[PDB]
Every structure is written in structure tokens, then in C-alpha cells.
Design a binder for this molecule. Structure first.
Ligand SMILES: *[C@@H]1O[C@H](CO)[C@@H](O[C@@H]2O[C@H](CO)[C@@H](O)[C@H](O)[C@H]2NC(C)=O)[C@H](O)[C@H]1NC(C)=O
Ligand SMILES: *[C@@H]1O[C@H](CO)[C@@H](O)[C@H](O)[C@H]1NC(C)=O
Ligand SMILES: *[C@@H]1O[C@H](CO)[C@@H](O)[C@H](O)[C@H]1NC(C)=O
Ligand SMILES: *[C@@H]1O[C@H](CO)[C@@H](O)[C@H](O)[C@H]1NC(C)=O
Ligand SMILES: *[C@@H]1O[C@H](CO)[C@@H](O)[C@H](O)[C@H]1NC(C)=O
Lengths: 242, 90, 105
């Protein structure tokens, strides 16, 4: 199956090497997967994925000139499980209202991007455990009061791995049930506010490998079962309530 | 060629299964591969990777959450497929 | 999962073409399971086919019009295994563009 610029394969759509600056409006409303690869898209407009009650995954990968994600791009998507934004060299701006109520969001991947701020997830309210995997975004330097609140109603894994995080603010993980936290390879990060885990279910697994962190907060680590630093810890320390 | 690696499918979990009432699990083998990153790709990335890997994993396409014996809640897989890996990195 | 012969495409931007080179990389099968019991402290692990060791080799690349020949250095698998993709050196996706991808043609 075909359209000029996109292939309507079997409920799995691929816009590759595109003749687009905008996501087409005439995409079949019953798609399970949309892939945008090697595209010439500059913006992903508002309500881009509006009207897809069957959409399960959105892959946005290797888009050279993708620069902006408007408001309400990911909304009214009851079946959406996975968002993958990979390799957008010039994506410097995601609108603070891009993501909205995805009861089914299991996975959210943002990697090798130019964004300078962590996504605003406080409206997602996903009903399942979410894996938030934001990596290789060299321009993200800060996590702020209430960054992952409202993401999900449960256990959440945050891979804030390999960016340019240098400062985390108190209550960064407030209102969140921290299943796992990876802050590895953010090698300019050297301190954790003594109130980072304030109002949180505290990390069960905590990854501070390759940072300059040399101490942890006194409270919040009551459920720490594993600490990845230079080596891994568990029954190598009974004070894994530091 | 086909050296041996069983296909991704449903199997019964020996530890949570009981006679008359088994719970099933997705295990098996999926295809994957590594190869030199296309020059074109390196242009889409702020962080340069000379090698690219594509992989798929054996996971549960659909399941039921049932309770067994010792008060553990577990997933009873009903369908398998080779799909996205989330826990294979670094 | 074993070393296989593949054809990768090397492209010269200035010249608007690629040349094809035969080399050796990783491909095949690896075992993985999907847990039925979750210990938030004993999370899952998956393994992929990928290199255990690799070397670099160079190749001369034809010129054109107003651009002389050049050199290109590329990775060659020496040994594969089912392991974790090393995200320092590897791009761990579901799909890339493919080895023999070319912007022209
Ligand atoms: C810490 O987390 C809670 C959410 O779990 C934040 O929300 C407070 O409580 C209710 C929702 O449970 C909200 O309607 C209020 O707006 C919040 N109250 C306050 C004082 O802001 C709470 O804000 C977070 N605390 C901090 C330090 O910002
Ligand atoms: C698990 O599901 C299978 C069918 O997919 C069924 O035969 C089996 O009885 C189920 N086990 C439990 C514990 O309910
Ligand atoms: C990756 O390739 C570039 C050339 O494209 C080379 O200069 C560099 O040394 C390589 N990096 C590694 C990790 O070997
Ligand atoms: C790849 O091809 C060469 C011949 O060009 C051959 O000698 C070699 O055995 C092949 N590689 C493998 C591992 O089968
Ligand atoms: C590499 O070998 C394969 C068949 O073994 C063939 O298709 C191809 O022509 C060879 N490459 C070159 C550069 O000749």
C-alpha cells in the first residue's frame, strides 16, 4: 500500500525521506503505529495525532531539522503505549503542554536531542508504570521542584542517564514513587539537595555512576536495595540507609 | 545458520505452575544485529556512535494478572512476540 | 548470533555517491525471557547480538569533479556475543537505516 510520501502499510505507517514539513492530515485514522524517519519535518503541529483511538507507538527518529513540538501533540490517545523521539539534532523546543492524559503510557523515550529542559509530564497521569528514558541530551542541565509529579499513578523508572545535568533542586521527585533513578554519566553533577526525595517513595535502585557526587541525603533512601556508583552495593553495606 | 536457539513462545513457569492450573511465560529467541553507523545517521545525532545495533526482544503481547499460592501477584502471559527491548543497554 | 559477512555503504557527500564495501559484522539470535514475577529490586535483563571486540580499517574512496580521493575509517566486528549493547559506542535502536544505506540513488 502507498500514498506518495508515506506508505500506508498494514496499519503501520512510515514517512521516510519525506516530502513533508508537517505531518499529513490525510493519515488513516486506524493506525497502530506511525514512524517518521529521515524526515524534513520542522514542526509537529498541534493535534497532530488527534483522532487516533488505535495508536500504540509513535517513533520519531533521525529527523535532521525537527525543531519544535507544539502543544497537545500527544493527547486523546487512549491506546498509546510508547513514544520514541530519537535523534533530533535541532529539536530545541518541546512545548510545556505537549503531553496530555495518556492513561496507557508505558514508555517515553527522548534521546540524542537538543532539548534543554526535561519534558512536562505532570498532565500525563498514566495508569501504568512508566519507563521514562531521557538520554544523550547534552543540553539538559537542571531538574526542578516537581519534575516527575503526575506522570503516573505508580512505580516509575526514570533514566535521566547521560545528559548535562549539573543541578537538581529539592523536591525534584516530590509526589513520585521512585522505582529506579539513573543519573549516571551526568559528570558535572556533584551534589544532591538534602531534600531531593522530599515527598517521594524514594529510589529502590539508585545509579550515580560517573558523577562527582560524594554523599547522599540523610532521608529518602529508606528503600534503597541497590546503589550503582563505582561498583554495585546491597549486602556489601547494611547502612544502605544512608 | 540454524544453530540452536528456540523461537519466542509461551512456556509454563516451573516455579509458579500447579497441576490443573499453569501460569505461562514468554521466553525464546529473537533476531538482532550490529553494523557500522550510516554516515547519514551520524548527522541526526549530537553524540557520535560509530556502531548501530538493532534488536528485538521476547515479550508478552497480552497477559492476565492472577494470584497464586504464597500471596504473590503474577502475570499469566497469553501471547508472545519479538518486540522492543527496554533493558539491554550499557 | 555469529559473525556474518555484510555489505556496508560508505558515502561521499561532496561527490553525491556511496561505494559498497564487504565487511564482517554481527547478526543472529539471542535468548530472552519476559518475567512473570516482579521484584522491583531484581529488574530484568535482555541481551542482544553485538560485538565483543572490533577493529578499524581504512579504505580509499573515489573522488569526482572537484574533489580528490579520500580515506574512510570504519568498524569491523572481530567477535560477537549475546550481551548488552554498549551505549557508549553503540546506538541501541529497534531499527537503523541499515548497513548499506545511501542518500543517493
Ligand atoms: C509534593 O507533591 C504533591 C503531590 O503529590 C504536590 O501537590 C500538593 O497536593 C495536592 C495534590 O495531592 C495539590 O492539589 C496541591 O497543589 C499541592 N500542595 C502544595 C503545597 O503545593 C505538592 O505541591 C508537592 N510539594 C512541593 C514542595 O511542591
Ligand atoms: C494461564 O492462562 C492459560 C491460557 O492462556 C490457562 O490455560 C491457565 O489455566 C492460566 N493459569 C492460571 C493460573 O489462571
Ligand atoms: C569513530 O569514528 C570517527 C570517524 O568517523 C573516528 O575519528 C573516531 O576515532 C571513532 N571513535 C571511536 C570511539 O573509535
Ligand atoms: C566472509 O567472506 C570471506 C571471503 O570474501 C570469507 O573468507 C569468510 O569466511 C566470510 N566470513 C564468514 C565468517 O563466514
Ligand atoms: C562481496 O561478496 C558478495 C558475495 O559473496 C558479492 O555480492 C559482492 O559483489 C562482493 N563485494 C565486492 C566489493 O565485490
Amino acid at each position: 500500500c502507498h500514498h506518495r510520501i508515506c506508505h500506508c502499510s498494514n496499519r503501520v505507517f512510515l514517512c521516510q525521506e519525506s516530502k513533508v514539513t508537517e505531518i499529513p492530515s490525510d493519515l488513516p485514522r486506524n493506525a497502530i503505529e506511525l514512524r517518521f524517519v529521515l524526515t524534513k519535518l520542522r514542526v509537529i503541529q498541534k493535534g497532530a495525532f488527534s483522532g487516533f483511538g488505535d495508536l500504540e507507538k509513535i517513533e520519531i527518529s533521525q529527523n535532521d531539522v525537527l525543531e519544535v513540538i507544539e502543544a497537545d501533540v500527544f493527547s486523546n490517545l487512549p491506546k498509546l503505549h510508547e513514544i520514541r523521539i530519537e535523534k533530533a539534532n535541532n529539536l530545541l523546543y518541546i512545548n510545556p503542554e505537549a503531553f496530555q492524559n495518556l492513561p496507557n503510557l508505558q514508555y517515553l523515550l527522548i534521546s540524542n536531542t537538543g532539548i534543554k529542559h526535561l519534558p512536562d509530564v505532570h498532565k500525563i497521569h498514566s495508569l501504568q508504570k512508566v519507563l521514562l528514558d531521557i538520554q544523550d541530551n547534552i543540553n539538559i542541565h537542571t531538574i526542578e521542584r516537581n519534575s516527575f509529579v503526575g506522570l503516573s499513578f505508580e512505580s516509575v523508572i526514570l533514566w535521566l542517564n547521560k545528559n548535562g545535568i549539573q543541578e537538581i533542586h529539592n523536591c525534584a521527585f516530590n509526589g513520585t514513587q521512585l522505582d529506579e533513578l539513573n543519573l549516571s554519566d551526568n559528570n558535572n553533577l556533584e551534589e544532591l539537595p538534602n531534600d531531593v526525595f522530599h515527598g517521594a517513595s524514594g529510589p529502590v535502585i539508585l545509579d550515580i555512576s560517573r558523577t562527582r557526587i560524594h554523599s547522599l541525603p540523610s532521608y529518602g533512601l529508606e528503600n534503597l536495595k541497590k546503589l550503582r556508583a563505582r561498583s554495585t552495593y546491597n549486602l556489601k553495606k547494611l547502612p544502605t540507609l544512608e | 545458520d540454524v544453530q540452536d536457539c528456540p523461537e519466542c513462545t509461551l512456556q509454563e513457569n516451573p516455579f509458579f505452575s500447579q497441576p490443573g492450573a499453569p501460569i505461562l511465560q514468554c521466553m525464546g529467541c529473537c533476531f538482532s544485529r550490529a553494523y557500522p553507523t550510516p554516515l547519514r545517521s551520524k548527522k541526526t545525532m549530537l553524540v557520535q556512535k560509530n556502531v548501530t545495533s538493532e534488536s528485538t526482544c521476547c515479550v508478552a503481547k497480552s497477559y492476565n494478572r492472577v494470584t497464586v499460592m504464597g500471596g504473590f501477584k503474577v502475570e499469566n502471559h497469553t501471547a508472545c512476540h519479538c518486540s522492543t527491548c527496554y533493558y539491554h543497554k550499557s | 548470533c555469529e559473525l556474518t559477512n555484510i555489505t556496508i555503504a560508505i558515502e561521499k557527500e561532496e561527490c553525491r555517491f556511496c561505494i559498497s564495501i564487504n565487511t564482517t559484522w554481527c547478526a543472529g539470535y539471542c535468548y530472552t525471557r519476559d518475567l512473570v514475577y516482579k521484584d522491583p529490586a531484581r529488574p530484568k535483563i535482555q541481551k542482544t547480538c553485538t560485538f565483543k571486540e572490533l577493529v578499524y580499517e581504512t579504505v580509499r574512496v573515489p573522488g569526482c569533479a572537484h574533489h580528490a580521493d579520500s580515506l574512510y575509517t570504519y568498524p569491523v566486528a572481530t567477535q560477537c556475543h549475546c550481551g548488552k549493547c554498549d551505549s557508549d559506542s553503540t546506538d541501541c535502536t529497534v531499527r537503523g537505516l541499515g548497513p548499506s544505506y545511501c542518500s543517493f540513488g
